[PDB]
C-alpha cells in the first residue's frame, strides 16, 4: 500500500478539496448546479472516475480548473491503484 | 485466466449485485429512474465501463454508494483483464 493506500490518501483529499473549491467557484454563476457540498462530492467522484453522467458539471472558469485538477489527480490515483489492486 | 477469468467472475457479480442494490436504493426517491432491474443492469454496465451516457444514473445517497462500488470494482476488473486480454 506504499503505492496503493498511498494514492487513496491523495485522492480522498482532492475529492474533498475538490468538492469544496467546486461549490466555492460555482455559486455566483447564475444557472450553476454545482452549488452544494453534498452533491458536489458526488460530482467529484463521477469526474475522478471519468464516468461523468452530466447530471452535474462545472460552468465557471476556476470551476473548470478544479475540475481539471480532480480529473488529473484522479485519473492517476486510480491508475497507480490499478497496477496494484491487480498485480 | 487465473487473473483474467478471475476478474470476470468478480465483475459479473458486482454488476448483478449492483443492479439489485440499485433498484433497491433508488425506488422511494421521487424522480429516480434507476428503479427497475432490467435497465438497472444496463446502467451498471455503462457505469462499470465508465461510458456513462446519463440516460440513467443514481440520485440517492446509498444509490450513489453502490454506484461508487460498481465503478471501482469495475474500473479494476477491466484493468486486470486489460494487462491480460492484451499480453
Amino acid at each position, epitope marked *: 500500500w506504499r503505492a496503493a493506500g498511498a494514492a487513496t490518501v491523495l485522492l480522498v483529499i482532492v475529492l474533498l478539496a475538490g468538492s*469544496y473549491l467546486a*461549490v*466555492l467557484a*460555482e*455559486r*455566483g*454563476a*447564475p*444557472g*450553476a*448546479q454545482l*452549488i*452544494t*457540498y*453534498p452533491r458536489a462530492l458526488w460530482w467529484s467522484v463521477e469526474t475522478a472516475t471519468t464516468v461523468g453522467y452530466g447530471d452535474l458539471y462545472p460552468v465557471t472558469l476556476w470551476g473548470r480548473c478544479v475540475a481539471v485538477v480532480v480529473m488529473v489527480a484522479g485519473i492517476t490515483s486510480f491508475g497507480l491503484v490499478t497496477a496494484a489492486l491487480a498485480t | 485466466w487465473r487473473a483474467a477469468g478471475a476478474a470476470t467472475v468478480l465483475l459479473v457479480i458486482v454488476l448483478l449485485a449492483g443492479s439489485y442494490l440499485a433498484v433497491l436504493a433508488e425506488r422511494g*426517491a*421521487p*424522480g429516480a429512474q434507476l428503479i427497475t432491474y432490467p435497465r438497472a443492469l444496463w446502467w451498471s454496465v455503462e457505469t462499470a465501463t465508465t461510458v456513462g451516457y446519463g440516460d440513467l444514473y443514481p*440520485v440517492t445517497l446509498w444509490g450513489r454508494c453502490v454506484a461508487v462500488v460498481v465503478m471501482v470494482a469495475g474500473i479494476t476488473s477491466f484493468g486486470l483483464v486489460t494487462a491480460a486480454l492484451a499480453t
Partner: antibody
Amino acid sequence: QVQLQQPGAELVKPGASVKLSCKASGYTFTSDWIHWVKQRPGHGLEWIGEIIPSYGRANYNEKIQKKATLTADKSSSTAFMQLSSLTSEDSAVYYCARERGDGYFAVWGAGTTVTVSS
Amino acid sequence: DILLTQSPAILSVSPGERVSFSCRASQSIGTDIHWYQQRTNGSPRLLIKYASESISGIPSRFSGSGSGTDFTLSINSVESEDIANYYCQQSNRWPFTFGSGTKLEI
C-alpha cells in the same frame, strides 16, 4: 441558545449608510454560508446575498440594485452587511440566516428593522 | 433564474380540514424545494426540506410531496396555530429564490 443574534432596529437618514450585524453561536463549520434576506412590510422574502466566512467570498442577487456589501469576522463569529446610500425603498426587515452548505436555511435571526427617514 | 409560483395567494379552510399549498417551478428542480412558515411578526421557520423530508420539532401534521416542477405542502387537520404565511424556496440552481407566499386562513 439563539444561533443568530441581530440588533432590533436601525434608523437611517436618506442617503446615509448603515452596517447591520449578525452574531452566530452554536456549531460552526468551514462549509457554513451566511445569507441575508430582505422583507418589506406586507410583502414576501427577497434574497440579497450570501457569504462564506471560512473563505470570505460573497455573492449577490443580480436581479436587484446592489445596496449591500457583505463581510465576516471569524474571531468574533460575526457577519456584517453594509447598506449604503439608502432611500425609503430600503426600509424593511433584514434577516440573516445560516445554511450548512446544503441548500436550506436551518435557522434565521430575529431580523433588524431598518427605517430610512429624516 | 428559477421562478417559483405560489397560487392561490390565500387559502381558506375550515378547522380540522386537510389543506394543500401549491408551488410550481419555471423549470425542473428535482426535489430541491424547501418550505418555511412565517407567523405574523415572526421570523421564517423551516418546515420541510428537499420536498418531503421531516424536520425534528415540526408536528407530524406537516408533510410535503412532489418532484420536478410541481410541489405540494400539506397539513392534515388544520388548527389555529397554523395560521401564517407559507413560502417555498429552491436550491437547485444559483441563485436560490423564494416563492411569493401563500397565507392560510381559517
